[PDB]
Design a protein around this ligand. Sequence first.
Ligand SMILES: Nc1ncnc2[nH]cnc12
Ligand SMILES: Nc1ncnc2[nH]cnc12
Lengths: 178, 175
Amino acid sequence: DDKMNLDFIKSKIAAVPDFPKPGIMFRDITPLLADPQGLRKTAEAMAQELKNKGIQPTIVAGTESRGFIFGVALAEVLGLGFVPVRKPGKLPRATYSVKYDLEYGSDSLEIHQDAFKVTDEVLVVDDLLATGGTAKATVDLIEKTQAKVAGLIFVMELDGLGGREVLAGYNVSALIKF
Amino acid sequence: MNLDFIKSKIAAVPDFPKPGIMFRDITPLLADPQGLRKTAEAMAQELKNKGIQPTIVAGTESRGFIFGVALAEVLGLGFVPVRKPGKLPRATYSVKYDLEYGSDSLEIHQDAFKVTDEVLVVDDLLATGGTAKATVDLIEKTQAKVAGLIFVMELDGLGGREVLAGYNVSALIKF
Ligand SMILES: Nc1ncnc2[nH]cnc12
Ligand SMILES: Nc1ncnc2[nH]cnc12
């Protein structure tokens, strides 16, 4: 049944050549999203992996924006709250901020200082693990609140781009690997 | 009781983004373990009370992805992201909307909807309606139909509803 669910999720991810630049094979979640069971089966597969691993978060965090999609769907399945990790300048009350490296330049993410209780074990959700830059900035952000990271889970991991190493010391799951 | 619960988790924040504006902050609603499911359930009740039976949900990047996903799940429907520019990888339609100064765009994949779809737009807030109207227009470039638009919140007097003249508009709460 787990292979079967995983095969369904895999069967809805398109591969798109040369996007956003030449040479990059883009992994496209839109057909998964569009299917009436796509999000639900994805979030149920995520819950199964977490259960297998004994990971029991208290709340879910997602980054702007595809963290919002899968994070909200997973939060629903687990009966948990959700916290947005936003681009800078969007959150209205006091925030923490963490800068991360891009190929050229840098950027930041923020969370409300009060987003997590100090007893929270936070599950980070996102679509795709590549370099792990925004995932690590997310972990740092959570830790600023004094809450603890329960783990990180992705729909997809890109083999060999170093994300999982960047996230050493944290439990990392990914449903599909490319 | 349900609407009151949702209202009670939308914090009022003075002077954001700038002196004078009263910001309506959904974060405490999102953090509550029942905030999103209650919100989605209240939206689904509204749509049944108005006879709107969409075939697919479109959520506006980025807070419409939050409420859109939640409501799509309650409805048993699929979800289409309406995205900021340069994010969707396949052939897209594009529509411009006005910002304070200059403009920006929203995109959808040209294959996101069929001619037979009846699309529900979901977003957190109806303010000027700039983005919501661009979304309607995107939808209509596919020749699918707009079933309706639903928002958590509507800001009274900013003209949003009027910009969306001719479409079925619902908002859970008016501020
Ligand atoms: N190759 C890729 N496909 C889809 N999303 C991405 N985000 C970063 N790299 C990506
Ligand atoms: N006043 C407001 N409060 C919350 N979100 C908004 N988006 C635009 N105006 C807003």
